[PDB]
Amino acid sequence: HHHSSENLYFQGHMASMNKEMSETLTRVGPNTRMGNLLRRYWVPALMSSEIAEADGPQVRVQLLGEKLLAFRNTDGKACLISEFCSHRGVSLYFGRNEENGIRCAYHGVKFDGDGQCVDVPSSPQSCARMHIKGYPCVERGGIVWTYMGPEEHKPSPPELEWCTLPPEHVFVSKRLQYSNWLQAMEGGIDTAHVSYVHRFEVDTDPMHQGVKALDYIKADGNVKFEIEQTPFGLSLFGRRNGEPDSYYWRITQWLFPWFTLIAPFGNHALGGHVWVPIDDHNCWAWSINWQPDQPLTKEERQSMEEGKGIHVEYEEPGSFIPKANRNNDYGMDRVAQREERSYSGIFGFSAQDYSLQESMGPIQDHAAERLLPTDKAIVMARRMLNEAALGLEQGETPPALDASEQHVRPAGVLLPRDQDPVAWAREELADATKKPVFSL
Amino acid sequence: HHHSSENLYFQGHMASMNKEMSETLTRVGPNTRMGNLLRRYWVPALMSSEIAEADGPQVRVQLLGEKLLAFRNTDGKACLISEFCSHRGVSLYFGRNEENGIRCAYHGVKFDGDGQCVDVPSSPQSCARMHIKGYPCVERGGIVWTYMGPEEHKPSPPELEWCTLPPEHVFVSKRLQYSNWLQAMEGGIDTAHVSYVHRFEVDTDPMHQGVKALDYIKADGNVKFEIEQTPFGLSLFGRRNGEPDSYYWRITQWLFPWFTLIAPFGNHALGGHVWVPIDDHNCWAWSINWQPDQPLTKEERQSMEEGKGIHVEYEEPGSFIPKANRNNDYGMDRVAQREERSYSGIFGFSAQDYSLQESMGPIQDHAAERLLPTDKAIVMARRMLNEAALGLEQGETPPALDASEQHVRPAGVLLPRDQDPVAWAREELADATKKPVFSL
Amino acid sequence: HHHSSENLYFQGHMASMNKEMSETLTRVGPNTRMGNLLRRYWVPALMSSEIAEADGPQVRVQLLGEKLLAFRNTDGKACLISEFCSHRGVSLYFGRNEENGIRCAYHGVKFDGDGQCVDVPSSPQSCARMHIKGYPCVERGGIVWTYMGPEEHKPSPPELEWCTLPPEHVFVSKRLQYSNWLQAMEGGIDTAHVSYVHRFEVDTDPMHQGVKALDYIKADGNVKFEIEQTPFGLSLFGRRNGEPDSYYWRITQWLFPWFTLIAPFGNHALGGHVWVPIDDHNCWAWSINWQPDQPLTKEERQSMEEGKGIHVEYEEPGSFIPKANRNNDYGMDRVAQREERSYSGIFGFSAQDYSLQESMGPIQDHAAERLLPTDKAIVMARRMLNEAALGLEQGETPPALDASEQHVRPAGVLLPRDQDPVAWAREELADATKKPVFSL
Ligand code: FES
Ligand code: FES
Ligand code: FES
Ligand SMILES: [Fe+2]
Ligand SMILES: [Fe+2]
Ligand SMILES: [Fe+2]
């Protein structure tokens, strides 16, 4: 136990974060508690498509405070190294990807994919003092993943369902988000939000519309939660009223430290997020859709490419800033707000969510938060993160390192009000990726 | 007395501000000395026209360091609350103005105009812990005023002449100014400025031109001052040479803490300012024109709408940034400067003044100021402000709280050089809003 | 000796800067060690052409941390004063250049070219307390130079070759550079760079192309250095392989504290730089071309005006920001990079160099530099600067104050591998501006 560990409840409501814990969770740079924790997991760096071909243009990428450079060498292996030449500090973005390496444009020093210095023109014997940081990589889901932690503790690469399926079952997008990773992830472990800001989007949008779940979601925002701790993270049982006999359970899966699997809408593709910290004020927000049984159709895949569903349209090509952003007021339409075609005045799943999270300021004011029951999932995920971060300081091994425990699924069920859903899911969600999808 | 109180004179010239006093007067945020002083007066928040209709789009407004949200409820009452949901800190700009309240777009918590939480979906019993800051409001002059101080010390709403007249006698505009409130207000208690930067504007401009005062103003920048302290603030007797027998007295009224009434030009409408701090580096600069006797004509009102006189044209619609600003060099025309159609090279009353005040940097370098005689009004207003601010710390009641003492007028008179103007004004400016305007 | 003085070598490689020395050299503002050192030399402020005519528009100029104003008075003398009115701190950019002075636009105070206050309307006796900083000036090379140091130590104005020649032998340009003066100057005392980033530019460009030096430069980046200390700065003997019998020596001249003369390419005009600190994060980079024997032709002069050679094309007219800059990715063409028409992917001498130096961040990370042999000149210039800066603190007189020692030239020679170049240059580079140019 460490003083920082906040109590779960205070005066009979859930308790907010104390100052130190606020910091433990938000500060992600090198040699921070959370910086060190996050380094132990495989990290999604960028998409394979951004560095498609060998000897192709390198791209700058910033993760967990460090500034890096991604490129694909001559053999075709995706590599990731530090952005800066060890010589006089110039950027290797201006260098030359060729002959299995990056060669600095200033004086010709060359580094390979592991950041080993392999040529120094003026001084061949200096190689060993010119090494820079290079990080191992693997490709899965159409994403380049990197391992940024101590060499001896590198785990098995992740085996989430969208990472194991064949390519054309899967579709991935990413968006830059002008806020700290925490508040953003917090948004996808809060199913009560869907009943308010998304109330009217849920009907027009092709990845969501025309399924029976919507009648129940629309008609009750008041979500009671049950939370079960597991080898991979948490399972979130979000209860709403079904019929008068019954309850609509949405079960979303939180896979520590930064993944969700969202409970389905009908036979529409399954959805998921990742959030990756760029610094303490920004993050990559990843969105994944995938179908377990058939390929994605063309009307599915194309709808995603146009930026419907949990995806977005971009400001300019290869921008990764959304079309709706803090410069155009996120497209606010007050007229639409009055006529009840949009709750917030903003259009689009993604925008409706990040508009609000950006508006909190880069880091949410944790001091001024006053929590409610709908925040049960959030509070527990915070504890798991804090206790892992603090535990790693003290030499404990962090949770969820074992990829085989990540073969799981979200779900929806209608159930009588006396049936216990945790028991139900013991029965039904064992070996869940072999069964079809539990849906409504 | 407090060490901060600077002496009025040093080595036979007027004395500049010491470091602490510099700070006492410029730092306007919550729980500062000047923050607390200013909170005791009614504060001009925004114009009624910006939130014209009920259930209409709320607007963000920042005053005295705090970030707020203004809107007009269903009954039609202008309200002003804190910008941020008490729940998880999201902006209420994205919420819903309806049924006498703002409802947060994220999870549906609703606040009324006094910032009382009136609905919590997930937890009806939590209402009392979810309150936010809400501030009483009143409408006068076409302006929404708010009272931001302790509840028990709220005074009578202000009774300045342009606040009591009927609407069509009055016209109000506001402009965003990229500098601290102090240096800006200081500019409208410095009538010597008019003889230099405005020398050539005073003739072309329809709210100023073709009156006899101009010959005397143009022909003498060297203004001797007499200052009389009063219940409402200060009276500023600015002396210039008239004929060889006489003196042209411009009497401007400074109404503590942040108002002026400017001495008239002819029968042209009367003019006035307010300056309101947004933060320590910016302020709203308000300009008011009004006619006591008749309505404003259409050529008057329209000229003001086009941005002549003490008003401005805007960069874009509903911007409140001026057409001439720090990005276009305030429109500088050096050719016009050489040909003596503009002193500074810049066109427009307002621009000619704020161009210079913005150029001092956000906060004037008080350490490096070397004062002259034309700065007599400035020095005294500084003392009144410092002594009120410091006195409030020590439990003294601040000046000018009583609205009835604000029924006053500015004036111009030609007078023989032996006649004392203070005596003159005892006689003539008693009950001044009942008489016509003393002018030239 | 002062602890700061770093050792020249560590573990058999050249040693990087310690923390304090890093600071000694980069911090250039008033009352810093390096601020004080640099003040003792004549400083290039701006070009004569920017303030061509008398009573012409003044221009803002920022040097060595101070913010100034340059203008040409009625007599025609270039003057330089502090930007700000001593009265209430307004900018004199808005004032009036006429009758041998600048008159403030606010209240009419006037200053002459030495910063003496010569008129105060409200108070003639106040003149002596209203003085501001004014700095003596002289014109040479088409540049206004100013002397910003104590009055009693003003030296003779500089007698560099391009300062003494007649106007039409000479051409000067300047560019704003988004980095500290040091790393930029460091770039022009590093001839090994030319073999890499400039490899392909050296052939297409009319101030460089079609001369025999290129074959030798292209074919060896591995530059051995010999450095000889002199009255004016350092002489840099950069050795590359010539034929198998011989060595191509490029001798560049570093004239303390911030000038270079670059070793020639053929009969193409001679080239030189200056770097002048604006603040700790930016600098003016000056480029000079000149021909000693004939005028510059029209195809020479015009090519320079179009921004070829060590000059640049600008973003907009009178901008001084380059066409290629940090906003357009410096024009990167990866296709050209692959097809070996550009090493870095960037086009243009100047851009190829400053792209890399800007990319280090405003101040190079001196802690993380790992030096190589090609950095011999850099290391020594750093010592000369540190020891002068530290010595001035202790009352020692700084080096290179004597203009007559600046009548020198750069050179290239092919030489047998047994001939010593320093001896060669004793013989040949005595009285070098009287001889023709040693070239290849
Ligand atoms: S900075 Fe990269 S090789 Fe010199
Ligand atoms: S943040 Fe406003 S109700 Fe949740
Ligand atoms: S500020 Fe320059 S004269 Fe008043
Ligand atoms: Fe959502
Ligand atoms: Fe004015
Ligand atoms: Fe170069």
TrEMBL record, chains A, B, C:
Keyword Nucleus assigned: no
Sites where the protein binds [2Fe-2S] cluster: 85, 87-88, 104, 107-109
Superkingdom per UniProt: Bacteria
MF-aspect GO terms: 2 iron, 2 sulfur cluster binding; iron ion binding; oxidoreductase activity
Keyword Oxidoreductase found: yes
Protein keywords: 2Fe-2S, Iron, Iron-sulfur, Metal-binding, Oxidoreductase
Domain Rieske: 42-146
Pfam families the UniProt entry points to: LigXa_C, Rieske
Residues binding Fe(2+): 193, 198, 353
Record protein name field: Rieske (2Fe-2S) domain protein
The organism's taxonomic lineage, starting at the top: Bacteria, Pseudomonadati, Pseudomonadota, Betaproteobacteria, Burkholderiales
